[PDB]
């Protein structure tokens, strides 16, 4: 029941098309209210709320620190991008694909993949079924993998083969798992 | 397309709790363990590809603490509003009897960043074998967190992820069974 008081500082490096365009957003947040920020597109501190006004004024009066902050897209954002690139931007983990009837409802389970961009498609006798398709969407597991469920509503015939197909940057040929019963 | 790297830090009173972490596209690259004063990589392989000087983060946290104390007074001692967590329990992969798997407790959209998380197997707490991430940042300046429990699936056993936060009226129990 003791009251709490929280301060957060965030340096956000935003990268567009590799390091072609970089934007730094430094944010100060008291409790849940962002109070002051440095935006590299702006080039100086701006207060977001009345709380941040003394900070914007005072910090902007410091010319060397402002000039270092303006260089930060290079000395900081692009630098750290360069260091982490091979194991972050370039990280590739191959999905595990499982197909099973749901506990008339077929489930394609795709798990343990990275990065998050993926295309999952359902086939019935080699032809794509685009209707009756429901997806759980992207799920971040917190350990640098994602998972997803893609469901197909069907009425299975006796000799039908349903195939789940997974396109992902980690696999040069899209993966396929067949199901029939 | 777009990538984002965030250096996210916090200090919290009266708990005197600090955090320093890097986030890439919503995943933790590393954090600094305040007690041990050491860099801890989220995927331990990252530690063979890069280094990070823990002392710089400790200096930052001391700045954060001092800034929090200034703001606390300036806000006229306005405390944070508790926002309770949403809790979701899922598994690493489709469960198969006896095949090692992981229960994942996803705790999301909450502040302040203090939570008590306990796994329950058949009503009884699980005291060893668990692991967890630090608090991860959100764009709305709330937090998320993941807790993990490796297990052997079995229709017999049941599990709950029990979550306590000042924003809740009582422990939140998210249930799972084969």
């Amino acid at each position: 029941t003791r009251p709490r008081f929280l301060w957060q500082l965030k340096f956000e490096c935003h990268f567009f098309n590799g390091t072609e365009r970089v934007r730094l957003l430094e944010r100060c947040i008291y409790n849940q209210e962002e109070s002051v920020r440095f935006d590299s597109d702006v080039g100086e501190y701006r207060a977001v709320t009345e709380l941040g006004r003394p900070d914007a004024e005072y910090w902007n009066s410091q010319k060397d620190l402002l000039e270092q902050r303006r260089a930060a897209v290079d000395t900081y954002c692009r630098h750290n991008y360069g260091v982490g690139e091979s194991f972050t931007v370039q990280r590739r983990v191959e999905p595990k694909v499982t197909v099973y009837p749901s506990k008339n409802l077929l489930v394609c389970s795709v798990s343990g993949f990275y990065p998050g961009s993926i295309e999952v498609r359902w086939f019935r006798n080699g032809q794509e079924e685009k209707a009756g398709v429901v997806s759980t969407g992207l799920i971040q597991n917190g350990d640098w993998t994602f998972q997803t469920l893609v469901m197909l509503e069907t009425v299975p015939r006796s000799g039908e083969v349903y195939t789940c197909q997974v396109e992902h940057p980690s696999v040069t040929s899209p993966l396929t798992v067949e199901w029939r019963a | 397309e777009e990538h984002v790297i965030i250096q996210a830090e916090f200090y919290l009173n009266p708990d005197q709790s600090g955090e320093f972490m890097f986030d890439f596209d919503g995943d933790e690259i590393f954090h600094v363990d305040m007690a041990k004063k050491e860099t801890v990589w989220r995927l331990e392989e990252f530690g063979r590809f890069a280094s990070f000087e823990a002392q710089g983060a400790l200096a930052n946290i001391a700045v954060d603490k001092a800034n929090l104390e200034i703001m606390t007074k300036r806000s006229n001692y306005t405390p944070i509003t508790n926002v309770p967590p949403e809790v979701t329990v899922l598994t690493n992969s489709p469960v198969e009897l006896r095949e090692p798997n992981v229960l994942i407790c996803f705790i999301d959209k909450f502040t302040p960043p203090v939570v008590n998380v306990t796994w329950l197997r058949n009503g009884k707490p699980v005291t060893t074998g668990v692991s967890e991430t630090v608090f991860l940042p959100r764009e709305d300046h709330l937090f998320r967190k993941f807790h993990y429990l490796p297990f052997l699936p079995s229709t017999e056993d049941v599990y709950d992820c029990r979550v306590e936060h000042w924003g809740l009226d009582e422990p939140l129990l998210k249930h799972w069974e084969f």
Binding site: Q62 | Q7, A50, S51
Partner: peptide
């Protein structure tokens, strides 16, 4: 007075 914290840097390891 309110202090500006430092944007900190990772550095690459040999291999």
């Amino acid at each position: 007075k309110m202090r500006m914290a430092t944007p900190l840097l990772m550095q690459a390891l040999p291999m």
